[model samples]
Target chain A: FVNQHLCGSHLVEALYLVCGERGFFYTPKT
Target chain B: FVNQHLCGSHLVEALYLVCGERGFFYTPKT
Candidate 1:
């Protein structure tokens, strides 16, 4: 669950698009 | 669910830093 927004990181959404949003999450430490 | 040097994107490593070292993974879409 990334906080900066996936759209900003095209690569982020791209991965979710194929990597499948099943068990994926990104959370910044700070 | 995303790529690019997670370190480059402090947010990336931040997640791995606290988000835990398991289940979490990253790979550039390209």
Candidate 2:
């Protein structure tokens, strides 16, 4: 039932953990 | 440079805002 939600949230959390703070940002190209 | 994130991610997900998932980590201080 709500398993899908948990799975999706977990996946997102894992991604965030791997990426860290910079995960949310795009690097600027000079 | 700081504006980069909003522009890039925004362009990619025009219809929806990019929401990041977060996790907390504890660092031991001696």
Candidate 3:
């Protein structure tokens, strides 16, 4: 199984991970 | 009104919008 595609965000290490070929990344604004 | 600072996203017609003080929109992946 190709592991069913998952979609959404996570909150670990205060990091968020979204579903997509190119994972989403967030940077704090200065 | 000065619009008093704007930022975030919008969802319409199954579309997602982002905030950039100038409105943000998303494009579907091919």
Best prediction by lDDT: 1
Give the per-residue lDDT of model 2 (tens digit) for A1-30: 867445644444444445544453321121
Looking at model 1, give its docking quality level. Answer: incorrect
Candidate 3 residue spans exceeding 4 A from truth: A1-17, B1-30
* Alpha-carbon deviation at A17 in model 1, angstroms: 24
User: Tens digits of per-residue lDDT for model 3 on A1-30?
Assistant: 422111111121122113222323332221
Q: Residue B10 error for model 1, in Å?
A: 1.6
lDDT by residue (B1-30, candidate 3, tens digit) is 122111111122112113322322232232
Write down the DockQ of candidate 2: 0.06
User: Model 2, residue B22: displacement in angstroms?
Assistant: 17
Q: In model 2, how large is the Cα lDDT of residue B2? A: 45
lDDT of each: 0.45, 0.37, 0.22
Candidates in descending lDDT order: 1, 2, 3
Candidate 1, position B4, lDDT: 34
lDDT by residue for model 2 over B1-30, one digit each (tens)?
447544533433321223323332222121
What is the Cα-based lDDT of residue A26 in candidate 2?
A: 24
